[PDB]
Structure formats: C-alpha cells, structure tokens
Amino acid sequence: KMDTNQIRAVEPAPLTQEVSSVEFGGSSDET
Amino acid sequence: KMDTNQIRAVEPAPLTQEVSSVEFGGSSDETDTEGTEVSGRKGLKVERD
Amino acid sequence: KMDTNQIRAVEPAPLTQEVSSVEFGGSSDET
Amino acid sequence: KMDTNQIRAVEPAPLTQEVSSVEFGGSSDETDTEGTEVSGRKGLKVERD
Amino acid sequence: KMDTNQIRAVEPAPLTQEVSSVEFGGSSDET
Amino acid sequence: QDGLINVRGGQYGRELIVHINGKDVAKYKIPDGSQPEHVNNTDAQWLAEELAKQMRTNLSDWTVNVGQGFIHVTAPSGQQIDSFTTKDGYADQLINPVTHYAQSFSKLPPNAPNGYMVKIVGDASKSADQYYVRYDAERKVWTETLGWNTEDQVLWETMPHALVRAADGNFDFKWLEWSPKSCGDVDTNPWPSFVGSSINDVFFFRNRLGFLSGENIILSRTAKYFNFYPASIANLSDDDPIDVAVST
Amino acid sequence: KMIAAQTAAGRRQAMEIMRQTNIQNADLSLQARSKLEEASAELTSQNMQKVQAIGSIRAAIGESMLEGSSMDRIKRVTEGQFIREANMVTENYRRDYQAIFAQQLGGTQSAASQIDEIY
Amino acid sequence: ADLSLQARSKLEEASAELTSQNMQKVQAIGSIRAAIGESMLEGSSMDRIKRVTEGQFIREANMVTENYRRDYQAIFAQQLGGTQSAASQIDEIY
C-alpha cells in the first residue's frame, strides 16, 4: 500500500478564484 | 403635497412566524394512524382477554 | 455498542442567537 | 440634452440561468445509448423467450 | 466494508445560501 | 395543467408580465412610489390579487385563486398551459413561475396550495435526484410523496399471508397489509424484485423479514416488517430495506 | 411667481425623499424574503441530516433485540435535539425579520419628519 | 459596466467551483463504482447507494448555480438602482 499511502499525503490546494471590481470617480461641473 | 399623518400611519408587512421547508421521508414517526407503525415484536404481539 | 456509536454521529448544531437593532435618521429644521 | 424617460427605459442585461463547466470522464452514467453500459453479470445475462 | 469506507470519503459541502440587496441613491431638487 | 406564480414585492415600478400559451396575460406596472398611497402597492398580497383580476378577464374559464403569497391557475381541462413564463421587468426575484418541475428544492414556493406536486430534477441527463415532494397546508412544510401516475401497492392476494392468533384465543388467517411505496416513481424506486417471481423462503434475519425470490435476497426495514421500500429517494436513511441479487 | 417655484421645488424634494425611502423599504422587504429562503434552505439541510441520523438510530435499536421504554427514549431524545435546533433556526429568522421590519419603519418615520418640515 | 464585468467574473468563479466540485464528483462516484463491482452483491440496493451519492453531488452543483443566480440578481438590481438615481438627478438639473 505504498502507492496509496503516499498519494494520500499529496494534498494539492484548490485555490478558488478571486476577482475585484473597477472604479470611476466622476467630475463636478462649474459654469 | 402629500399628507402629514399618512406617511406615519403606513407600517411594514407583518411577521411571518414559520418558514416552510422540505420534510424528507423518515422524519415522521409514531403518528395516530391506525396503520401498522408499531415496530418489532411489540406490533406482532396481541393481548389475550 | 451500536446505539452508542450511532448517537455519537448525530451531532446537532447549537445555533446561538443573533439579533440586530433599529435606526432613526432625524430631520433638519428650516425656518 | 438626453431624455429622462430614455434613461429609465434602459435596463441591464438579462439573467443567465446556467453556468458552463467541465464534465471530466466518468460523470455520465446509465444513459440511453444502445452501447453496452450495463455492468457486471447483469449485462452478460440474456433472457429466454 | 468497501461500500461504507468509500462513501464516508464522499463529503459534499453544505453551501448555505447568501444574498445581497439593492440600493437607490436619491436626488436633490434645485428650484 | 396547473401552475403557480410566486410574489415577492415588485420593487416599486417594474413591469410584471405573465405568458399563458404565448399571450401577454395580466400585464401590470407598479407605480413609482412617491405618494404614500403607492406604498400599499408593494406588498406581496396585493400583487397576487391585482394580477389575478387581470388574469380572470384574459382567460376564458381558467379558475384562478390566490393564497397568502401565490397565484394558482387551473386549466379548464380542455387545454393545458404548454407555456408558462413571467417577466419581472427587474432582476428575477419579483415574480417567477412555479410549474410542477423544479430544478432544486431551494427553488420552491414557500406558500403553495394545499396539495402541490413537484418533481425536483436536478440534472435532466441523470436519474440522480428526481424525487417528488408535495406541499402540506396544515403545517407549512413540503413532504415528499411518490410520483403521480405510479402505483404504490402490490395485490396483497399473491403476497404471503399470516396466521394470527386473535385476542379472544381464536386464530385469524388474513393477508398481510404492506406499506405503499411513498418515496419515488417506478424508475427511481424500483419494485421489490419479487413482484414477477414466486417467493421461495421466509426467514428473520437481524430484525428484518426476509424473502428469497428467484435469485435475489429481499430484506425489509429493521423496524418495519411489512415495509420493503426505502424511506427517501435522497439521503438514504441506513434503515432502508436491502435488495441484492447474488452475482456469481 | 418666484415663491411658487420654491414651493414647487419643496414638494418635489419631498417626492424624492419619500421615493428613496420607499425603494429602500421595498429593498428590505425583498431582503426579508431572501432571509426566509436562507432559513428555509438551512431547515431542509438540517432535515436531511435528521432523517439519516434518526434512520440510523432506528436501525440499531431494532437489531438490538432489547426494546423497552429506555430504547424508545434514546430515539425520542436525539429526535428532540434536532427539533430544538430547528426551532432556533426559525427563531433566528424572526430576530432578523424584527430588525429589518424595525429598520424599514425607522426610514418611514425619518422621511415623515423631514417631509413635514419642508412644508 | 463595471458590475456587468463583475457579473461575468462571478459566473466564471462559479464555473471554476463547478469544475472543482466535478472532479471530486468523478473520483468519489468512481470509487463507489469499484466497490459495487467488487461487492458481488449486485441488485437494486447497490444501484441505490450510487444513485443517492450521485444525487448529493448534483445538489451541490444546483446550489452553486443558485448562489450565482441570486448573486446576479443583487448586482442586476444594483446596476438598475444607479440608473434610476441618475435619471432622477438629471431630471432635477433641468
């Protein structure tokens, strides 16, 4: 059971995705 | 021009006390149905008069 | 020990309580 | 100049109900294909008429 | 006990639902 | 034949449209909400009433009644729905159609009528989890029930009988009243596999009534001797009966 | 004429502040429905574990060949544990509703005082 | 337009989760397929436990899709809320 024991110790990480959002400021009008 | 007291008199929708949910089979047990729900040898036994 | 083993697998959740609070805005007076 | 009704009439893009994904081999099973998918001795047995 | 051992390794997730809310900015009236 | 419409609140000014057989039945637009009088127009109950009244006029007979938070539509038994969809004029969570086929148990109406059957088919491809649930009105809960067109009982005339000593001391020889299947349809809840073959032997394995059909062992539930069917299509209870056909 | 325009501005300002709090109040009403669904989905998930656990308990008591009042009790108690936490899920939803119901009300009263002050 | 791109982002985040749950689905179901074959019991009961376990994984995918669906609903509403707020404010300018 050497193959089964070691592969159980592999444990790769899932690392789910993460995304953010963009921004805009805007302006104030004079005259 | 709206009404002064009309805004205040308005109230939100009232409380809903219970939330509906799925009840999977096997949760119900020991009801009042005459159908045989008594289990084990207790159901098979019948008293002698 | 069938009864003791299975009851240990029951594990109901405590689900402690949680409550929030109301908010009032107020008004600004003019003249 | 714009039209204040025109801004209100604009609505966002509609809902997309389902999201695409990958089905790695082995997820599909027990389909309607005539090809032999029934497994074990059940598939090898044949009834008599 | 092959059936019981492997099924215990299945472990699907709960995935409780999560919701957000809408927002309205409001407007300031001039003259 | 029957349908439902959820109601959630309308969010003040979104066009609500109902499609019945391709017709834009009962189109209604909530107002903006500036006046306090418009505040009454957002609650879920009043939307159910208003949409029903327009639905009555557009549809010939189509007996329609409204519950605490839904709208129930019944076809006149002449023509079926054949197309049931609604437009919120918003994100979907204002009014969504509720047919008899839900994708998920989460996507279910809270209120529903007294008896409403729903087939939750999570994936069309897969037999999977195509279990039926039916609403109970006395307590606001959905209880799973077997399929609509399926038959739940064996004849009881060909199934084994029992010789029972009565209370008075005399002996009765009755048939055994078994339990109707109450979990799923014939495809998802198959027959006990002795319904076509004779029963060879009877025994009592560990608190289970046991039958030997032609080739396969059939054991009942642990508690219930006469119940040979699993309790639930999903989430098997570990008490459910076992049916195994010896390989070899 | 100028004073009439200012009063016309005053009422239209009241229209928007009332409309804004109405949108927010209708928002929370939809949010209340969302919290009902979240609680409802939790109750089904708790119900899924309940029937498996209670179904498992029924299996061993039947095979225990002992029966009696005590074995009826252990099933009775562990069934009670699932019910009491199921009630608390409903109670937590009520606590959530009471807060947002109050929060909706607070906005209406806040809008009422401001509108009355404008004119 | 930001939230519209954000909706697309949430779609592909959910899509990535769907594949991640799916690759565990085939390993778990594939593991059961072996034991059922090795059990030599066969019969209706064995087809059930694979069916029930497969049912759990399909419920997993349905809820992920549902969570994205109401994720879209919240930001669809938020986009619309900004549009109406802009419409009213623009109207008051004139």
Curated annotation (Swiss-Prot), chains A, C, E:
The chain holds residues 11 to 41 of 88 of the full protein. Signal peptide: none annotated. This is Protein 6.7. It comes from the Viruses. One of its GO terms (cellular component) is T=7 icosahedral viral capsid. The keyword Metal-binding does not apply. Keywords: Virion. Its main location: virion. Plays a role in virion morphogenesis, and is ejected from the infecting particle into the bacterial cell. It is found in: Virion.
Curated annotation (Swiss-Prot), chains B, D:
Disulfide bonds: none annotated. Keywords: Virion. Coiled coil: none annotated. Residues 44-49 have a biased composition (Basic and acidic residues). One of its GO terms (cellular component) is T=7 icosahedral viral capsid. Its main location: virion. The chain holds residues 11 to 59 of 88 of the full protein. This is Protein 6.7. It is found in: Virion.
From Swiss-Prot, chain F:
Transmembrane segments: none annotated. It comes from the Viruses. It is found in: Virion. Structural component of the short non-contractile tail. The tail complex is involved in viral genome delivery. Forms the end of the tail, including the canonical tube, the nozzle, and the small extensions below the fibers. Once the tail tubular structure is formed, the interface between gp11 and gp12 generates the proper environment to interact with the six gp17 trimers. Interacts with head-to-tail connector protein gp8, the tail component gp11, and the fiber protein gp17. This is Tail tubular protein gp12. It comes from Escherichia phage T7 (Bacteriophage T7).
From Swiss-Prot, chain G:
One of its GO terms (cellular component) is host cell plasma membrane. It comes from the Viruses. Keywords: Host cell outer membrane, Host membrane, Membrane, Viral genome ejection through host cell envelope, Viral penetration into host cytoplasm, Viral short tail ejection system, Virion, Virus entry into host cell. Transmembrane segments: none annotated. It is found in: Virion; Host cell outer membrane. GO terms for biological process: symbiont genome ejection through host cell envelope, short tail mechanism. Interacts with the portal protein. Interacts with gp15. Component of the cylindrical core that assembles on the inner surface of the capsid during capsid formation and plays a role in viral DNA ejection into the host cell. The inner core is composed of stacked rings of gp14, gp15 and gp16 proteins. Following binding to the host cell surface, the internal core is disassembled and gp14 is ejected along with gp15 and gp16 into the infected cell. May form a simple channel spanning the outer membrane. Belongs to the T7virus internal virion protein gp14 family. This is Internal virion protein gp14. It comes from Escherichia phage T7. The lineage of its organism: Viruses, Duplodnaviria, Heunggongvirae, Uroviricota, Caudoviricetes.
